[PDB]
Amino acid sequence: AISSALPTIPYHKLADLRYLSRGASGTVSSARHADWRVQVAVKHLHILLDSERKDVLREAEILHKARFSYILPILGICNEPEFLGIVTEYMPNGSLNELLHRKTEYPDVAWPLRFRILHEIALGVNYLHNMTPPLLHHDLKTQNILLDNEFHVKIADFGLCKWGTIIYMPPENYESIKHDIYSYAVITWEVLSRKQPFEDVTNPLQIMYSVSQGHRPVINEESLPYDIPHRARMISLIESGWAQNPDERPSFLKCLIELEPVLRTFEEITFLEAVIQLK
Ligand SMILES: NC(=O)c1c(-c2ccc3scnc3c2)nn2c1N[C@H]1C[C@H](C[C@@H]1O)C2
């Protein structure tokens, strides 16, 4: 049984600790490690409770166990009297949300990159489902799909995972291994549309009411234009992914088997050309 312990990092090694974003999960800051000479991110708490400390230790244990090419690499934990935080690689290219919706900043996200992003999310979630015991993310949303310096996907935010918005939640969870694939489908719709799901709906409960009656983000020529590569296959994958009956949604293994032939139609250089075009 080959084991490794998550390193502990003294707070004083984390220089230039500057705020990046607050959230529900906690506050995320950028720093640089004095010994290692690389920029890092730290997720920490707003400046010392008991079961708050339990939650962070849990998430850090998970990240450490879930290490994978498409999962945010934990570098260590800061564990001290005054300060508690998870230290990971800094993701300089933001989240997928920002990529899709900041259209002035990113007017062209070429198709090959979008497909790669969808492929890599799938590979990341699939890995988690294939752990023993399976880890279910249960909070997949475009905000939690971070993008590295090369625009590769790192999945983040393991606060609601089991060994804010409801747009990505399947109808049955309003009061299951088929949750993540539902979230995935909506993300797939979002990525291919660059639209907000249910854009023309004021109230979340109106969405929930509609979703529980079988309605889904709209699929027409306006949402998903006719020039999308593999439009028809992608629409099937979306529609099965978010099917009303959870039993009718695919496993991520099935999903990946559907994606592989699509991803193979993109030459490797077109991903690089896609990334270079971006800000
Ligand atoms: N690693 C990062 O760079 C992060 C993290 C982050 C850090 C540590 C942990 S431990 C569990 N999940 C996380 C997520 N969140 N964000 C990041 N990057 C950009 C987008 C926003 C803020 C930044 O502009 C969100």
Distance CA 79, CA 214 (A): 46
Instruction: Write out the binding residues.
Output: 20-28, 43
Mind giving me the DSSP string for 76-124?
A: EEEE-SS-EEEEEE--TT-BHHHHHH-TTT-S---HHHHHHHHHHHHHH
Query: Would the CB of 99 count as within 6 Å of ligand 1?
Result: no
Fold designation for 1-279: Transferase(Phosphotransferase); domain 1 (1.10.510)
The rounded distance, in Å, linking the Cα atoms of 108 and 216 is: 26
Contacts of range 244-251, beta carbons closer than 8 Å, 24 or more positions apart: 244/171, 244/214, 246/170, 246/172, 246/176, 246/178, 246/182, 247/178, 249/178, 249/181, 249/182, 249/185, 250/181, 251/129, 251/181
Please name the residues in contact with 40: beta carbons below 8 A apart, sequence gap of 6 or more.
14, 30, 31, 32, 33, 75, 87, 88, 89, 90
- Binding site as annotated, residues for ATP: 20-28, 43
Experimentally determined by: X-ray
Cα 60 to ligand 1 centre (Å): 13
Place of tokens 């747009």: 167
The residues, any chain, with a CB within 8 Å of residue 89's CB and separated by 6 or more, are 40, 41, 72, 73, 75, 148, 154
57 within 8 A of 26, measured Cβ to Cβ: no
Helices (H) and strands (E) in the chain, counts: 8, 7
> 76 vs 5, 57, 58, 63, 110, CA distance in Å?
9, 11, 13, 10, 35
Q: Where in the chain are the domains?
A: 1-279
* Active-site option among 139, 157, 180, 247: 139
CB of 19 closer than 8 Å to CB of 88: no
Q: Please report the resolution in angstroms.
A: 2.7
Return the axis-axis angle of helices 252-263 and 231-241, rounded to nearest 10°. Answer: 170
If you search the block for the tokens 């799909």, which residue do you land on? Answer: 145
What are 252's two structure tokens?
A: 């991520």
Which of 43, 97, 135 for a ligand 1 pocket mutation test, highest count of atoms within 8 Å of Cβ? 43
